[PDB]
Amino acid sequence: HMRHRTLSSSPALWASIPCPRSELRLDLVLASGQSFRWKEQSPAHWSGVLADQVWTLTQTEDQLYCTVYRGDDSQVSRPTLEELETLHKYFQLDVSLAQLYSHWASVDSHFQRVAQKFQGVRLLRQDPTECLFSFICSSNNNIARITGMVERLCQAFGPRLIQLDDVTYHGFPNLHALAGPEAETHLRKLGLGYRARYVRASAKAILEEQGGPAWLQQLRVAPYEEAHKALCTLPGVGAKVADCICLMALDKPQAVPVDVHVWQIAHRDYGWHPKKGPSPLANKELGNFFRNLWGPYAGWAQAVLFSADLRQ
Numbered sequence: 495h496m497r498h499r500t501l502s503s504s505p506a507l508w509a510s511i512p513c514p515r516s517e518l519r520l521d522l523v524l525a526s527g528q529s530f531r532w533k534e535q536s537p538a539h540w541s542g543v544l545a546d547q548v549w550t551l552t553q554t555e556d557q558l559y560c561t562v563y564r565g566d567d568s569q570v571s572r573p574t575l576e577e578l579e580t581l582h583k584y585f586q587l588d589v590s591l592a593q594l595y596s597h598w599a600s601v602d603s604h605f606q607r608v609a610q611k612f613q614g615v616r617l618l619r620q621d622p623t624e625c626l627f628s629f630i631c632s633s634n635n636n637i638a639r640i641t642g643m644v645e646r647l648c649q650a651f652g653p654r655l656i657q658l659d660d661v662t663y664h665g666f667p668n669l670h671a672l673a674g675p676e677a678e679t680h681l682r683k684l685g686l687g688y689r690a691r692y693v694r695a696s697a698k699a700i701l702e703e704q705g706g707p708a709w710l711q712q713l714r715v716a717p718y719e720e721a722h723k724a725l726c727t728l729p730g731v732g733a734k735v736a737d738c739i740c741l742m743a744l745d746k747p748q749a750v751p752v753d754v755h756v757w758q759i760a761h762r763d764y765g766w767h768p769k770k771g772p773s774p775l776a777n778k779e780l781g782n783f784f785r786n787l788w789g790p791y792a793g794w795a796q797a798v799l800f801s802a803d804l805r806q
């Protein structure tokens with residue numbers, strides 16, 4: 495009936511956003527442990543779902559090309575003005591990444607060497623609900639398996655949007671849908687394992703203990719430290735997951751997620767030691783170290799190194 499658009503196939507359905515590849519590289523961002531809902535369905539063409547709509551994204555040297563599938567078998571068209579603002583806000587393009595890259599490089603010789611090769615690594619501004627439950631699935635997991643669990647979770651619980659080729663696209667579920675009495679049993683069948691309990695328990699907790707999704711919007715305007723402590727009350731949400739949500743969904747650019755992986759990197763590349771191994775206190779100290787070094791956009795600087803580390 496319908497299928498994935500390319501820039502060759504249907505150029506009449508594409509809108510451009512003037513964006514250098516030094517400000518944004520899709521292939522270093524869209525599948526680099528931030529979002530798990532983007533796939534390169536055709537080469538250099540990234541498809542995924544953004545707030546009840548499917549997008550396909552490609553780019554040149556100084557143009558980001560995008561096209562929308564609204565579904566409902568309605569009259570197909572280019573992206574609108576409001577839908578391009580949505581994409582502009584999603585990539586946080588108002589913030590200059592080149593200026594940030596140079597600012598971080600000024601105090602960090604290691605970052606400067608890595609920065610050379612890996613440009614346009616920025617932070618996506620994700621939905622809190624989507625981000626929270628995606629990073630509850632992240633514990634003792636890899637990008638490949640997390641991407642599976644999230645896709646299957648959205649198919650099972652989330653509303654259907656459109657089909658392109660053999661790929662059916664579902665929007666992310668609401669909290670009520672994940673809070674049901676059967677929710678955990680289904681999610682174990684979908685292969686989440688122990689993470690199934692934390693998804694249901696956290697969904698039920700935000701509803702009953704915090705009063706629905708308006709709470710997560712309150713944490714967006716709340717100070718970083720208040721937001722982090724609030725999230726750590728949720729089942730299966732510790733310091734690492736709280737910092738991820740803070741950094742990627744609650745506009746806290748100074749949030750530095752710390753697990754064994756960033757510990758390994760911090761030690762090997764910066765020679766950092768707690769002033770022996772991991773610990774709630776030692777992890778907290780490593781986050782402060784990077785904030786002190788890089789400043790109030792420390793989480794954005796981490797994404798560059800993190801995405802750089804995924805590519806050998």
Ligand SMILES: O=C(Nc1noc2c1CCCC2)[C@@H]1CC12CCC2
Pocket residue numbers: 526527528632635636637738741751793796797800
């Ligand atoms: O940990 C993950 N992502 C991140 N943690 O810290 C940062 C990121 C992405 C960018 C900012 C810094 C995701 C869950 C995994 C485990 C392997 C993929």
Ligand code: NI
Pocket residue numbers: 761765767
């Ligand atoms: Ni050492």
